[PDB]
Amino acid sequence: RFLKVKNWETDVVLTDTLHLKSTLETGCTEHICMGSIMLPTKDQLFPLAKEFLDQYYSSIKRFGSKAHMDRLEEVNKEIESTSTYQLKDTELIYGAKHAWRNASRCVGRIQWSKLQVFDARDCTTAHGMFNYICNHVKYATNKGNLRSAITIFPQRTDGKHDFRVWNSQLIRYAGYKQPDGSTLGDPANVQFTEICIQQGWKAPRGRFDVLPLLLQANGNDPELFQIPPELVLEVPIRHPKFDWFKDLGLKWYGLPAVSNMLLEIGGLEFSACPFSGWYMGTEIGVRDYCDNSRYNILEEVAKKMDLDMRKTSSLWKDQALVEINIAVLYSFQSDKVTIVDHHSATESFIKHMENEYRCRGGCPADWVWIVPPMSGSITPVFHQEMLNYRLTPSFEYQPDPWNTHVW
Amino acid sequence: RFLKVKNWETDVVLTDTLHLKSTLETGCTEHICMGSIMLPVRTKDQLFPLAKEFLDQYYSSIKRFGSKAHMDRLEEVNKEIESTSTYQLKDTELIYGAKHAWRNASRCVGRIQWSKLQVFDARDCTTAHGMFNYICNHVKYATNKGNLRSAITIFPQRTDGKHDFRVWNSQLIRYAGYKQPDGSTLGDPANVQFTEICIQQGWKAPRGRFDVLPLLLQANGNDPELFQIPPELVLEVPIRHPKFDWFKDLGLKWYGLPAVSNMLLEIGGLEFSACPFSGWYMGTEIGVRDYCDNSRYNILEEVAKKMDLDMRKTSSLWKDQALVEINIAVLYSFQSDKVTIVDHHSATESFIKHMENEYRCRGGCPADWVWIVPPMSGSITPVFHQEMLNYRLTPSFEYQPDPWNTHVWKG
Ligand code: HEM
Ligand code: HEM
Ligand SMILES: Cc1cc(N)nc(COC[C@H](N)[C@H](C)OCc2cc(C)cc(N)n2)c1
Ligand SMILES: Cc1cc(N)nc(COC[C@H](N)[C@H](C)OCc2cc(C)cc(N)n2)c1
Ligand SMILES: C[C@H](O)[C@H](O)[C@H]1CNc2nc(N)[nH]c(=O)c2N1
Ligand SMILES: C[C@H](O)[C@H](O)[C@H]1CNc2nc(N)[nH]c(=O)c2N1
Numbered sequence: 106r107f108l109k110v111k112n113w114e115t116d117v118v119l120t121d122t123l124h125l126k127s128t129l130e131t132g133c134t135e136h137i138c139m140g141s142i143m144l145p146t147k148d149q150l151f152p153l154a155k156e157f158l159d160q161y162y163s164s165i166k167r168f169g170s171k172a173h174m175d176r177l178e179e180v181n182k183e184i185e186s187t188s189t190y191q192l193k194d195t196e197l198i199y200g201a202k203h204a205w206r207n208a209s210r211c212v213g214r215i216q217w218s219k220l221q222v223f224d225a226r227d228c229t230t231a232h233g234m235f236n237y238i239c240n241h242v243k244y245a246t247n248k249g250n251l252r253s254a255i256t257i258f259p260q261r262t263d264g265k266h267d268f269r270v271w272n273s274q275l276i277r278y279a280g281y282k283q284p285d286g287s288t289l290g291d292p293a294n295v296q297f298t299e300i301c302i303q304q305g306w307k308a309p310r311g312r313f314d315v316l317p318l319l320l321q322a323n324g325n326d327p328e329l330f331q332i333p334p335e336l337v338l339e340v341p342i343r344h345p346k347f348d349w350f351k352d353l354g355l356k357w358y359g360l361p362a363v364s365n366m367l368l369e370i371g372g373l374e375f376s377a378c379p380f381s382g383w384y385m386g387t388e389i390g391v392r393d394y395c396d397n398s399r400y401n402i403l404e405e406v407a408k409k410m411d412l413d414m415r416k417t418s419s420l421w422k423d424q425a426l427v428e429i430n431i432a433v434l435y436s437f438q439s440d441k442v443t444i445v446d447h448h449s450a451t452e453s454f455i456k457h458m459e460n461e462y463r464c465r466g467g468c469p470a471d472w473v474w475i476v477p478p479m480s481g482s483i484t485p486v487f488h489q490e491m492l493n494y495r496l497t498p499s500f501e502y503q504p505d506p507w508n509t510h511v512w
Numbered sequence: 513r514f515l516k517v518k519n520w521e522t523d524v525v526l527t528d529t530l531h532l533k534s535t536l537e538t539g540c541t542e543h544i545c546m547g548s549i550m551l552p553v554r555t556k557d558q559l560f561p562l563a564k565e566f567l568d569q570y571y572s573s574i575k576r577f578g579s580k581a582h583m584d585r586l587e588e589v590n591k592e593i594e595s596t597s598t599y600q601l602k603d604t605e606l607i608y609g610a611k612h613a614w615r616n617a618s619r620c621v622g623r624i625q626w627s628k629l630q631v632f633d634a635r636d637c638t639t640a641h642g643m644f645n646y647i648c649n650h651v652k653y654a655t656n657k658g659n660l661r662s663a664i665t666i667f668p669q670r671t672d673g674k675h676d677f678r679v680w681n682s683q684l685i686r687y688a689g690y691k692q693p694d695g696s697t698l699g700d701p702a703n704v705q706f707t708e709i710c711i712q713q714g715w716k717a718p719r720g721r722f723d724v725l726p727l728l729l730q731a732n733g734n735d736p737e738l739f740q741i742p743p744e745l746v747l748e749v750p751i752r753h754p755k756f757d758w759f760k761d762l763g764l765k766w767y768g769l770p771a772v773s774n775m776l777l778e779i780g781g782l783e784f785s786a787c788p789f790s791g792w793y794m795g796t797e798i799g800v801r802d803y804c805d806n807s808r809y810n811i812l813e814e815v816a817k818k819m820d821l822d823m824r825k826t827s828s829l830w831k832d833q834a835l836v837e838i839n840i841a842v843l844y845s846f847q848s849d850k851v852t853i854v855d856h857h858s859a860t861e862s863f864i865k866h867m868e869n870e871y872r873c874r875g876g877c878p879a880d881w882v883w884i885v886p887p888m889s890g891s892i893t894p895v896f897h898q899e900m901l902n903y904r905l906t907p908s909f910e911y912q913p914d915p916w917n918t919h920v921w922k923g
């Protein structure tokens with residue numbers, strides 16, 4: 106019931122008690138572990154509200170106070186009357202920060218308390234959503250000195266008037282199937298791109314076309330908007346040693362901004378809550394560039410490097426991977442766009458974990474996601490046992506809206 | 513129930529039914545996943561169902577399920593248990609059981625090979641000296657002058673828990689480690705405690721960086737005894753790099769034979785506490801873990817120095833650069849000396865083909881992602897992108913506590 110986690114490099118053991126608060130289910134049972142699986146009414150609402158307000162009033166050292174009791178009373182009144190309730194600004198901010206704090210797959214959580222929260226609950230139309238999003242993009246980008254931010258649109262009501270950003274990230278590149286059989290651009294976004302074209306977007310048909318936003322307000326049919334090009338900061342990728350690297354014509358965007366998740370706070374559901382931070386280099390250099398189903402550039406790079414690609418055991422893939430990732434970091438650093446390398450980020454996370462164990466009694470962490478996709482065991486997180494469990498407030502995956510939307 | 517796993521690179525989806533046969537626990541619950549936790553005397557009463565479950569699996573595999581031979585064997589085992597409180601496996605059952613414990617080993621990326629395993633039956637062994645002779649023979653057979661062959665040697669099963677056979681070494685071949693008065697370590701820091709035990713027992717330590725440890729062997733619950741493996745049976749590879757001529761001057765070498773000796777083999781409820789088993793290395797085990805863990809030989813700094821990489825900031829990825837070079841060197845050296853080794857690309861590609869085959873013929877393949885994904889270059893191997901289900905099947909290999917923590921010293 107009280108659980109130990111050990112670091113096998115340092116022998117440090119920490120004791121987790123925070124897990125006993127976990128509410129949601131993991132996918133695992135006593136018979137089967139699903140650790141590597143990617144996707145494993147009134148009566149319901151008051152308990153969820155109470156749990157949340159209890160933790161909130163606890164956090165501000167006012168647990169059991171009249172203000173605590175009065176707010177439970179007020180929210181109770183309101184749920185009974187209106188079947189939902191509204192968060193105070195202070196609660197919305199607390200909840201958003203804690204959703205990030207509780208994100209077990211996020212290595213960047215040392216930063217969790219420094220989150221700029223933009224309250225967009227007064228938003229009513231898609232044009233308004235576009236405005237809020239441009240402002241978030243500009244604020245978070247901050248000319249390359251990136252700042253964490255979330256923009257929170259109105260909460261789900263009866264579920265037929267959902268706000269959604271159809272895009273998976275605020276900034277992403279289009280994907281196009283070719284008569285050729287190949288894929289131009291990002292193969293991850295082929296389907297979403299078709300949706301955009303079918304809804305009107307005139308596609309430039311290039312390798313790095315920033316997609317338009319497809320915004321849904323109040324359960325209405327989603328509409329298209331182009332982010333002002335001048336607010337989308339991009340970085341050309343070059344290498345400090347290989348002058349030929351620039352000729353690959355690679356670039357990436359500076360701002361990672363997840364826009365397809367659902368924020369749950371005290372039982373309320375915010376289906377449009379785009380949030381952004383800054384990149385860890387491997388996300389671009391290892392995954393975006395080298396996944397076989399992504400830009401898949403390993404073969405081209407290795408060739409320009411004159412490596413022996415005859416046998417897997419020459420480690421030509423590994424050599425070219427390291428170089429691509431040196432180039433990503435160097436390109437961002439040279440242009441003064443915030444980025445973190447996987448060594449620095451993971452070292453940060455271990456310090457954050459220790460703070461959380463010391464101050465909170467634990468930290469939910471998914472080792473499968475936290476360990477970087479290259480050089481795993483030379484980062485400290487590889488050797489750190491982690492317990493994964495689900496705490497609320499939380500970010501949750503939700504189905505793509507085009508499967509849900511009645512047009 | 514059917515469970516699906518998806519490959520996120522290929523979109524190939526597999527359906528697992530094998531998990532229905534899982535009995536042992538995982539450590540996980542609906543409320544907590546313990547997937548990254550390293551570590552998450554039987555009654556007659558508990559033993560017969562375990563024996564029956566095993567014999568049913570065995571007789572099905574030979575297409576004799578429910579035959580007179582199957583029924584007579586159940587009968588024979590049942591009477592043996594009620595009368596002696598235990599039972600003996602037939603040689604065929606022992607072979608089948610040892611192979612299946614490997615097939616079932618969810619942390620093992622090398623399982624495409626599971627059906628090719630030489631089983632050495634050492635259940636007539638009675639003394640530590642006897643155990644030494646069996647282990648030498650295993651080493652020589654498995655080594656095969658560099659053309660490595662998988663093998664397991666199986667010593668007598670547990671009886672009352674007071675007469676256990678144990679190999680105290682964690683691997684048959686491993687290098688000594690010595691803590692110095694100034695707090696530095698000579699040799700392998702992983703083996704300091706065991707080295708101190710060997711010394712205490714009377715081993716004369718060479719006190720160098722790659723001293724092969726003696727065997728410490730316990731027969732029949734007696735105090736363990738020291739033996740030196742004949743040096744001519746211990747095949748080693750000096751490590752050099754194909755392009756960097758200074759790499760040899762780091763003085764590195766490693767042994768060719770990875771042989772785990774501290775695990776417990778469970779077959780049909782019987783417990784084989786000494787069951788050393790060996791295969792061949794995947795290069796990253798040596799190049800990444802043994803050489804580059806901070807807690808092991810920790811050579812990253814020296815290598816990067818000699819490569820003249822920019823070491824003033826981690827973001828030059830100097831560690832990653834040195835890491836790849838070291839792993840090239842390991843593969844190169846083993847290949848050059850004709851000692852079997854596999855790279856992490858080949859091994860993971862073979863594991864995926866193995867796993868798909870297992871899904872088709874067997875209904876599943878329990879696999880532990882945390883262990884199967886190599887410790888470098890994870891996502892450029894296909895296993896990174898493969899969803900896996902981890903569950904426990906028997907026969908199995910299990911962790912057991914180090915014997916110095918439990919042994920009753922006779923004196
Ligand atoms: C400030 C810098 C940040 C860094 C360096 C960072 C790092 C990361 C990384 C590397 C991932 C894995 C992404 C992947 O492989 O797809 C991740 C996942 C995630 N992070 Fe962050 N993070 C940051 C900020 C944030 C912020 C501001 C939030 C929310 C307010 C957040 C919530 C999440 C969530 C929910 C996931 C899991 C996403 C999913 O399941 O797809 N992170 N983080
Ligand atoms: C034939 C070549 C083989 C290869 C390339 C191979 C590969 C591996 C590797 C890389 C590991 C993880 C090692 C670590 O990080 O500590 C491993 C684990 C394991 N393999 Fe193998 N394997 C082979 C043969 C065998 C054999 C012959 C057996 C038993 C009969 C076996 C049973 C296991 C077990 C039980 C584990 C988990 C060990 C633990 O928990 O410490 N494997 N395999
Ligand atoms: C906020 C933030 C900062 C940072 N450095 N990196 C990120 C990474 O965002 C990318 C997303 N996690 C990607 C697109 O999600 C992958 C994914 C796929 C699926 C099927 C489910 C799921 N939960 N997640 C987000
Ligand atoms: C037979 C074989 C072949 C091959 N290529 N590799 C292996 C694995 O050898 C390494 C061992 N697993 C290492 C020493 O065990 C580490 C370990 C430590 C702890 C505390 C628990 C545990 N289960 N395992 C075994
Ligand atoms: C099947 C497996 O869960 C899947 O490939 C995961 C593994 N770890 C990951 N880790 C991160 N950070 N991001 C990912 O997309 C994935 N993919
Ligand atoms: C804490 C974590 O489970 C531990 O470091 C694991 C991770 N994965 C591993 N994978 C393999 N193959 N071998 C290991 O020793 C480990 N160590």
Ligand SMILES: [Zn+2]
Nearest residue numbers: 133138540545
């Ligand atoms: Zn689990």
